[PDB]
């Protein structure tokens, strides 16, 4: 479970899940942008399938999906 802060207002568990599908096999993914109630905090979560996959995406938190960076952490 790694946290991803920096998602855009139009981010989706799909674009993020895949952008991260390059690090390893993710079993879960989410987007914290409740843009319906006005709670789009451009920030969701990512749940890799194996630690190695997470440690990799963490080795380089210079991420930039949706045209923005993200705060990669231990979701």
Curated annotation (Swiss-Prot):
The gene is HNRNPD. The modification N6-methyllysine is found at residue 22. Residues 1-75 form the RRM domain. Binds with high affinity to RNA molecules that contain AU-rich elements (AREs) found within the 3'-UTR of many proto-oncogenes and cytokine mRNAs. Also binds to double- and single-stranded DNA sequences in a specific manner and functions a transcription factor. Each of the RNA-binding domains specifically can bind solely to a single-stranded non-monotonous 5'-UUAG-3' sequence and also weaker to the single-stranded 5'-TTAGGG-3' telomeric DNA repeat. Binds RNA oligonucleotides with 5'-UUAGGG-3' repeats more tightly than the telomeric single-stranded DNA 5'-TTAGGG-3' repeats. Methylated by PRMT1, in an insulin-dependent manner. The PRMT1-mediated methylation regulates tyrosine phosphorylation. Identified in a IGF2BP1-dependent mRNP granule complex containing untranslated mRNAs. Part of a complex associated with the FOS mCRD domain and consisting of PABPC1, PAIP1, CSDE1/UNR and SYNCRIP. Interacts with IGF2BP2. Interacts with GTPBP1. Interacts with EIF4G1; the interaction requires RNA. Interacts with EIF3B and RPS3. This is Heterogeneous nuclear ribonucleoprotein D0. The modification N6-acetyllysine is found at residue 68. The modification Phosphothreonine is found at residue 30. There is a cross-link at residue 32 (Glycyl lysine isopeptide (Lys-Gly) (interchain with G-Cter in SUMO2)). The chain holds residues 98 to 172 of 355 of the full protein. It comes from Homo sapiens (Human). It comes from the Eukaryota. It is found in: Nucleus; Cytoplasm.
């Amino acid at each position: 479970k790694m946290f991803i802060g920096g998602l855009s207002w139009d981010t989706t568990k799909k674009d993020l899940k895949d952008y991260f599908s390059k690090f390893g096999e993710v079993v879960d993914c989410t987007l914290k942008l409740d843009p319906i109630t006005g709670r789009s905090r451009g920030f969701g979560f990512v749940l890799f399938k194996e630690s190695e996959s997470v440690d990799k995406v963490m080795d380089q938190k210079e991420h930039k999906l949706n045209g923005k960076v993200i705060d990669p952490k231990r979701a």
